[PDB]
Amino acid sequence: VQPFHLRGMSSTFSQRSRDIFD
Amino acid sequence: PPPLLVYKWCQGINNLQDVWETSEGECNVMLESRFEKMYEKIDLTLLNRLLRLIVDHNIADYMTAKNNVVINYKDMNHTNSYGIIRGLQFASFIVQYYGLVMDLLVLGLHR
Amino acid sequence: TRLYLKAEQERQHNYLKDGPYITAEEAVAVYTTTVHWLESRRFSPIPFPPLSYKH
Incomplete structure (x- = not known):
């Protein structure tokens, strides 16, 4: 539970990940 | 053993319904190919989403969390x-499940 | 070895820079495809071994 959200990511890369993976 | 695989594949080619009859213009096609960069092009978030269907979610988080680590060579970190760590213990599962997802894309669900 | 490490460190930063190379629609397609296949076979998920699995 409580999805992974890789250590790493920058701002816009987090935005794109939250957009396409949710 | 893989030569038994070859022998059973030859027996399966032989034992079809009228496989060598070409009196009416039929054809046999043998495709062989390789998935290029199968090990490097696995996204880890997609892997976690596809992996949470078959195991407990903490197990999938542990399998995704091991892949996100720093690789070192003597001066270089x-x-x-992006891409899985192929030298893990449980990575032999990850290639065999993810490639199963390829079979639903190539072979089709009905077939 | 050092040249391949310089190539790998470059391509990982290129992935972090250019974003994910997969679109959302293809991900939804393969996700729903896996859902339909596993619901077609009645697959029961692998449980966590609680305290004593006896194997």
Whole structure:
């Protein structure tokens, strides 16, 4: 539970990940 | 053993319904190919989403969390974020399940 | 070895820079495809071994 959200990511890369993976 | 695989594949080619009859213009096609860069092009978030269907979610988080670690060679450190770490113990599962997802794309669900 | 490490460190930073190379629609397609296949076979998920699995 409580999805992974890789250590790493920058701002816009987090935005794109939250957009396409949710 | 893989030569038994070859022998049973030859027996399966032989034992079809009228496989060598070409009196009416039929054809046999034998495709062989390789998935290029199968090990490097696995996104880890997609892997976690596809992996949470078959196991407990903490197990999938542990399997995704091991892949995001720093690789070192004697002076050089870099983090891994795209593609799986192929030298893990449980990675032999990850290639065999993810490639199963390829069979639903190639072979089709009905077949 | 050092040249391949310089190539790998470059391509990982290129992935972090250019974003994910997969679109959302293909991900939804393969996700729903896996859902339909596993619901077609009645697959029961692998449980966590609680305290004593006796194996």
